[PDB]
Amino acid sequence: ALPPVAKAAQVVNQTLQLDDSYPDLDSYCRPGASSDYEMQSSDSSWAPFHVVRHHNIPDKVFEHLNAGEVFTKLGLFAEIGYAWASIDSSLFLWDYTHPNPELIGYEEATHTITAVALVPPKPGVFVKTITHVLVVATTSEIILLGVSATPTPSGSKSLTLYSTRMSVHRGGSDVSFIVGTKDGRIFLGGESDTDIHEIFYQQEERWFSSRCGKINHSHPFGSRQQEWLRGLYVDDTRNLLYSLSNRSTIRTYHMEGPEKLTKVIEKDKTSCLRDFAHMADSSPLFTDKTNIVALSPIPATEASKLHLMALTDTGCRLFLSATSSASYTALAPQSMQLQFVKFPPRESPTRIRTLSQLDKTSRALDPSALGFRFSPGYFFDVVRKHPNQDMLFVSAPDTGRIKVTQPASALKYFEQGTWIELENGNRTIEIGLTTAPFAAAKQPLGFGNELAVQFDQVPGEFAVLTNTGVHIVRRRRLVDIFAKALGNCVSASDDALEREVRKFINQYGRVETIAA
């Protein structure tokens, strides 16, 4: 009754639905806590990440850096494969993928540069060939430059700069953090206070309005205690903006319009600690002495409830939900609550290979100085136990185990982890994604299915900027691990393969293993 190709198409349709039923983040990070890790040696074929190459800082940048009179700073434009260095009032960009790069110098600025960022342009403003806007903040003003990052035959963007006549006086508030939205909105913050500013700009000059303006969205007044920002974070999928303060206060702002920004949540460390105390498992790794060192937004495509990850200096990952009071009038949330905690692993890095309760006391990630999360959960933590050498903890969801876990009530935040050692003197500065953002589906269910996209998009790669160079870290897929493991079985017995294969079956299941 039903011919071959139609029968096989039925199998495809049911297989597509099976891959798109991969558990969403909310489902395996339910209220509670977890310490589930399988640690892998960095030199192992089972390593979830590994360093593929490194790019030294050009010698000319070292000449300028050591010629610094007062202030210097480094940063990453990982989206286009560029890095930058500021020396006092001078800025230098370069393509770090190029073996002998030329330095793009920009020295028009009159005062010390305090922040630099590469953001999308405002639509309908610039010629289509302008791909980005370069924001340069000094102690006196903020400067906008047009950017065209067109790809070259070699695979590294060609960068040319355009003047704009767009600039505004800074004012009294320091600018150390610049972030941009998908639509080209530019937000500013710094180390003077917790105020958030926005830069507006338009093509036409008017007699009653300049081409470029600046406004303070915080509208402060009266008595104000000392407090400033540690970072700004954007989530376009929810039209939200987050700030982290030096007191570990998390503020949430909603973009109710193309020119509006409204503060909708303010959650201090005490509130986080109160939520934590109401959880079943309390821990000495999170107290009133603990600092939150970084935030990472979680987009709505990845999870409905969990909006935000917060990293403590003890290495705890705090996952916070946010909820609106109502269901209709984007809808702004009005509450934020600490729901789930991923506690640190226990295994420390070792030169020699060393040999079920919730582990809520590990110090392996203490102190955590910098932290980053990328969908579907790739986690980088800069652990600074010693003041000269950084250790990099890198982990990923155990996609294979999460996909096979049954029933749904048994789902936990299983992870594969590893330690990547940086040489003595390497101080990590920034980590950015070099490939396209990960997404296996368009909604939380199916979103995190790494297995499904092994052959549709290249493995994620991450540029780790240090004070000596840029290191490229690459995510390894099942097929990469399987191929590497088999490569070690080439010189062994019939039973040597069967043993290695059984490791894969016990983690990924038989079908996924045979498919690899």
Partner: peptide, 14 residues
Amino acid sequence: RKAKLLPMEEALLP
């Protein structure tokens, strides 16, 4: 080498 800054005329339309 100081980067050549092409003019605003090309940059913004129309």
